[PDB]
Amino acid sequence: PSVFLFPPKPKDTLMISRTPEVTCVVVDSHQKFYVDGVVHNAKTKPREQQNSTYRVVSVLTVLHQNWLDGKEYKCKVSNKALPAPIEKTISKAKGQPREPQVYTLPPSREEMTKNQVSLTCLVKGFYPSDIAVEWESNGQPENNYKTTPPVLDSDGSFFLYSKLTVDKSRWQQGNVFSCSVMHEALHNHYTQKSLSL
Amino acid sequence: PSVFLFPPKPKDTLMISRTPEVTCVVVDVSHEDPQVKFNWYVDGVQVHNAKTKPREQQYNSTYRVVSVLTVLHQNWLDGKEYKCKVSNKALPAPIEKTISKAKGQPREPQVYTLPPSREEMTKNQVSLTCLVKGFYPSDIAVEWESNGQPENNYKTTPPVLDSDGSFFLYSKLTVDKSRWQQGNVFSCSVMHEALHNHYTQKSLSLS
Numbered sequence A: 001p002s003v004f005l006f007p008p009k010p011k012d013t014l015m016i017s018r019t020p021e022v023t024c025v026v027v028d029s030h031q032k033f034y035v036d037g038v039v040h041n042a043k044t045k046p047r048e049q050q051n052s053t054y055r056v057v058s059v060l061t062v063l064h065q066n067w068l069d070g071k072e073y074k075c076k077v078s079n080k081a082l083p084a085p086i087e088k089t090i091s092k093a094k095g096q097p098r099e100p101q102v103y104t105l106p107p108s109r110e111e112m113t114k115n116q117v118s119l120t121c122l123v124k125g126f127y128p129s130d131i132a133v134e135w136e137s138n139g140q141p142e143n144n145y146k147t148t149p150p151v152l153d154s155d156g157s158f159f160l161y162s163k164l165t166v167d168k169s170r171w172q173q174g175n176v177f178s179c180s181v182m183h184e185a186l187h188n189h190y191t192q193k194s195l196s197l
Numbered sequence B: 001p002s003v004f005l006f007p008p009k010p011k012d013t014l015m016i017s018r019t020p021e022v023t024c025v026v027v028d029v030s031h032e033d034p035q036v037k038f039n040w041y042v043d044g045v046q047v048h049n050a051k052t053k054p055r056e057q058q059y060n061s062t063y064r065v066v067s068v069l070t071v072l073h074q075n076w077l078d079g080k081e082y083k084c085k086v087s088n089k090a091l092p093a094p095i096e097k098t099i100s101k102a103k104g105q106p107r108e109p110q111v112y113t114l115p116p117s118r119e120e121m122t123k124n125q126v127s128l129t130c131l132v133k134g135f136y137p138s139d140i141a142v143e144w145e146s147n148g149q150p151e152n153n154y155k156t157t158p159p160v161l162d163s164d165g166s167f168f169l170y171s172k173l174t175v176d177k178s179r180w181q182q183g184n185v186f187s188c189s190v191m192h193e194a195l196h197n198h199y200t201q202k203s204l205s206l207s
């Protein structure tokens, strides 16, 4: 039995409307489960579900503020097929947060030969790497997009690119598209950047 | 004892000039019984000796042993399977690992260059972007050059699985704002199995 601790979803810790959570994944035959120190009885929930095996995952609700402040979260198991318990722990990356720079980019000229085109959103200069990116069109969520994971830049900050694919006609008809970015160092943890021919 | 199988580098398989190889590594070899035998198979063949080449190395309280197998460019591009078998007197049973290029039909990458945003040109440095999409497998190499010389200040994202099963990525070249305004021509080089001579390039300039 090996234990893995996971951090909340970037977007979750950035909006009071949603719930950030730490997930403790215990993988793997063919059964038990502190934050900044302080012993027994939850803020948790867990469960036992199912290749051949167990995996008693436990989910804890974290306070948005508490996580952003760097508090530690310690997940201690307790099994009798293990010499000693496994206490994995995790916290938000350390260091001065840095505000993301957002830039939308039109499809390349050479691309306007295909029936679909690529709308690009460059997001650089941010720290920590936790961040959420989404697209919209006049108030409606675009589904066909992909974003690259964060990449460490030469100066200690991170970047990534988000790619929205849209029919060339929709881009020809002048529709406007927006790249939404959520990060802790953004005013109101949110900035939107628009794109259009 | 642990075994890890590493494939060759993207460019090694694409240029007959280079030497593509497969590296098998064993860590946590017992200090007492440090003897390790390697057996290599290319598509199940070759239990018997072939190229291969080990060494031996002592660490914290264990031994690390590396075996290197040179592969033929076309063998790798033709999907051949490479198996590394590691045996040790202190092992219940040998350990086997197999590697190859991903299964699927090669897809030619589409390479588009993108100038910096108008909104970024207010900074002392801008971003020249190169989009590489629609390729498979993900094994690929991307580089930048301005003239005949290599631009060193760039970062490439790792490939990302797109909606149609192909891969894409972006490489970002950072040049002083001044250079890009001076009309310098920059170039994105992409090397892949599905490209003509396993290569293509795209220019990016202000005009």
Ligand SMILES: *[C@@H]1O[C@H](CO[C@H]2O[C@@H](C)[C@@H](O)[C@@H](O)[C@@H]2O)[C@@H](O[C@@H]2O[C@H](CO)[C@@H](O[C@@H]3O[C@H](CO)[C@@H](O)[C@H](O)[C@@H]3O)[C@H](O)[C@H]2NC(C)=O)[C@H](O)[C@H]1NC(C)=O
Residues within 6 Å of the ligand: B002, B004, B027, B028, B059, B060, B061, B062, B064
């Ligand atoms: C005994 O020591 C060796 C070597 O430890 C070195 O660690 C580095 C950081 C160096 O600064 C110094 O501290 C030591 O020389 C340990 O060997 C390591 O074993 C792990 C296996 O878990 C290897 O990890 C694997 O790495 C590859 C990529 O390289 C990944 O693809 C795998 O998924 C996996 O992460 C690691 O490469 C080994 N490091 C070296 C230098 O070979 C060894 O673990 C340690 N004793 C133990 C705990 O077994």
Ligand SMILES: OC[C@H]1O[C@@H](O)[C@@H](O)[C@@H](O)[C@@H]1O
Residues within 6 Å of the ligand: A004, A025
């Ligand atoms: O559950 C996720 C974890 O699963 C393990 O099997 C490994 O793949 C880890 O690298 C990973 O963090």
